[PDB]
Chain A
Amino acid sequence: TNPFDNEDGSFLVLVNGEGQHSLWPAFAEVPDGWTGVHGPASRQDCLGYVEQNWTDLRPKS
């Protein structure tokens, strides 16, 4: 199983300077330029956070 699809994994939500959101496996170092804004939490919980809070896809810039 791909780690981004692991339903039993622990996950973060990350945001970059453009306001784009990413799911992220909590075991992995957060890449430069990304900030954790939610988690560690379930995969489904992180998807709910993104749907609620990432209203516009376009980069904020």
Chain B
Amino acid sequence: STVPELLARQVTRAPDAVAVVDRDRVLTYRELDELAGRLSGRLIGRGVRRGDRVAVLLDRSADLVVTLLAIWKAGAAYVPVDAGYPAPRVAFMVADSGASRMVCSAATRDGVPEGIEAIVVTDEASAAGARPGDLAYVMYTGIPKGVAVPHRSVAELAGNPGWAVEPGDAVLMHAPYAFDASLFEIWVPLVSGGRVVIAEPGPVDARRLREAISSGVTRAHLTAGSFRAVAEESPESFAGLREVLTGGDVVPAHAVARVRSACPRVRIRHLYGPTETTLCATWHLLEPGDEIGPVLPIGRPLPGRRAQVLDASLRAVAPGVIGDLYLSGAGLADGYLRRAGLTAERFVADPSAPGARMYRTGDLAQWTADGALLFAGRAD
């Protein structure tokens, strides 16, 4: 599948449902589809062809969502560049990814590197169509590397039934689109019929979260750092959410327990996974009313994914034994752009699935007796 294919199902089912809320600008599903189609036509007319990489340098906004979908409709892959990156980093990402064009705004126009065609988004509809085996994006992740992710992997993530996002949900969007969390913030609600609520400029703090919840936001992801801070300082600020999500850096069980005792009814979801396997490969969900206990698991593989904990001989270890964690099944990136050797040493053959690959996380983990995973630190 592709995220555009899943999105088209929602546009057909409820074209006049709200898709994107940006301050006072509101886009319905049909309006978003039509705007992206027009921008796709512009991209095709400027010479974008299937498989091209198009850099994006924009502030979060409805125009950002339109732009990403338009690049996809043109058959191309987006290269997300955060407007706050230094110019040498931006130049590297554009050149290493092979992007010859960059979509920007009046405000960001000055950040387009020399020799790169600037497409100012504020300036006929035609679409080539996204395909599952084509690249969807290149996300950079201490030398920067480009992770090349196909449409099929993005759709496996965004359309996963475990997200449990419904048409009435409103998801707060504030993560950098350069980052993986953006996939949940933007594509999960849109393939589910819900809406994306673009956060006001600046970092989301406890007060802004409370205001977003009062305005109708039902789900929000916070980085581990921001979640720990709010959990310890103002855990009642999560009240009214259907679900809060967090992951990345370490989240201590104590932080989750603080939220549960302040907010008995909020679902708390811990996410784990690298950019190489599309946002998250395992997760742990704390249901309303349940208490976390002394350790926060990284949890169980998402539906459609698999995890293995192997020893130095590549044999599966028994529960309670720490070994090397490998991630497989759905959601793997194609590899590292322009770096086949590096790809071949980290996306390796999977002994448990014929012809398949598994991603070597470089993390250590152990299983519990009933099949959850506990983090046991990075191997280095």
Interface string of A34-50 (1 = CB under 8 A from B): 10000000000011101
Interface string of A8-50 (1 = CB under 8 A from B): 0000011011101111110111111110000000000011101
Cα distance A46–B349 in the bound complex, in angstroms: 15
State the interface size on chain B (CB cutoff 8 A). 31
Interface string of B343-356 (1 = CB under 8 A from A): 11111111111111
CB pair B349–A34 under 8 Å, yes or no, is yes
Cβ contacts under 8 Å, A4 to chain B:
345-346, 348, 360
Instruction: Output the nearest chain B residue to A28 by Cβ-Cβ distance.
Output: B314
Interface residue B340 (Cβ < 8 Å from any Cβ of A): yes
CB pair A2–B343 under 8 Å, yes or no, is no
Which of B133, B345, B347, B349 has the most A CB atoms < 10 Å from its CB? B349
Interface residue B379 (Cβ < 8 Å from any Cβ of A): yes
Size band of the interface chain A makes with B: 35 or more
CB pair B343–A57 under 8 Å, yes or no, is yes
Which of A1, A14, A21, A28 has the most B CB atoms < 10 Å from its CB? A21
Cα distance A21–B345 in the bound complex, in angstroms: 9
Q: Would you list which residues of chain B between 304 and 359 have a CB under 8 Å from chain A?
A: 312-314, 324, 334-335, 337, 340-341, 343-357
Given A4-B345, A21-B340, verify A59-B133 contact (CB < 8 Å). yes
CB pair B341–A22 under 8 Å, yes or no, is no
CB pair A57–B341 under 8 Å, yes or no, is no
Instruction: Find B350's partner among A5, A21, A31 (CB 8 Å cutoff).
Output: A31
Cβ contacts under 8 Å, B343 to chain A:
21, 50, 54, 57
CB pair B349–A58 under 8 Å, yes or no, is no
Cα distance A5–B324 in the bound complex, in angstroms: 12
Least CB distance from B156 to A in Å reads 15
Cα distance A59–B362 in the bound complex, in angstroms: 24
Instruction: Output the nearest chain A residue to B314 by Cβ-Cβ distance.
Output: A28
Some 28 contacts from A to B, beta carbons below 8 A apart, are A1-B312, A2-B312, A2-B362, A3-B314, A4-B345, A4-B348, A5-B345, A14-B349, A16-B349, A18-B355, A20-B357, A21-B340, A21-B343, A22-B348, A23-B344, A24-B348, A24-B349, A25-B314, A28-B314, A29-B351, A31-B350, A31-B351, A46-B344, A54-B340, A54-B344, A57-B337, A57-B343, A58-B133
Cβ contacts under 8 Å, A31 to chain B:
349-354
Least CB distance from A6 to B in Å reads 9
Cα distance A58–B335 in the bound complex, in angstroms: 9
CB pair B355–A22 under 8 Å, yes or no, is no
Cβ contacts under 8 Å, A51 to chain B:
340-341
Q: Beyond A16-B349, A50-B343, list 4 extra A-B contacts (CB 8 Å).
A: A2-B362, A33-B355, A34-B349, A48-B341
Cβ contacts under 8 Å, B314 to chain A:
3, 25, 28
Cβ contacts under 8 Å, B356 to chain A:
16, 33
CB pair A22–B340 under 8 Å, yes or no, is no
Least CB distance from B312 to A in Å reads 6
Least CB distance from B69 to A in Å reads 22
Cα distance A2–B361 in the bound complex, in angstroms: 11
Instruction: Find B324's partner among A2, A16, A17 (CB 8 Å cutoff).
Output: A2
